[PDB]
Amino acid sequence: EAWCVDQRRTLEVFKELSKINPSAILSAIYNKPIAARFMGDVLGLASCVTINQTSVKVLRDMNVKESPGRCYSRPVVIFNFANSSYVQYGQLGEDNEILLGNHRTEECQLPSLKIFIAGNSAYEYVDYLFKRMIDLSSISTVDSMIA
Amino acid sequence: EAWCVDQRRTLEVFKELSKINPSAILSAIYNKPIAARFMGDVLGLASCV
């Protein structure tokens, strides 16, 4: 009895964060990885295309030209579909999604320090400029399981 | 069985609100009061005075 109540209200947290990042909450429910886009009261589905993999390249400046103070919230990227060789400009979404035209930018606050994981390497950006590769295994990971 | 599933998806709500106010979600998990700052995909720790 008490169970379906944890269940019933924690539905309403799902509906809530769906309004923010529907990809995540939907995937969490149905377990599939599933991309999804927010639209109003009604959240549509959207399907993916896997690109060249190698190569994808991470550009070292996260400032936009022009101008300051307009800065990308995520590192910008150049990738290829394949078979093909048209060089495109995505923007490193999380969990290896490359972002078409919705460029998360986000206006220049100093001083920053964010680090972004793409594939299996972490890229530390100190002041919207790149600084160093970061050891992905150095970063301890929150285990949370109430067992 | 059904338990670890409330557990598994409500991990993904934690990861989500960590992106907003990591201090809170982290403290909620580990029970300590713990300050923390958002940085990218990777959320650093920070200590108080």
Binding site: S140, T141 | V42
Partner: peptide, 24 residues
């Protein structure tokens, strides 16, 4: 308890990340 604090990141380390680490 919850004193009047000011919190910052001292050294470079240390950082925690999330990942999908529980599997049913």
């Amino acid at each position: 308890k919850y004193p009047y604090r000011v919190c910052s990141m001292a050294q470079g380390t240390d950082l925690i990340r999330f990942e999908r680490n529980i599997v049913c």
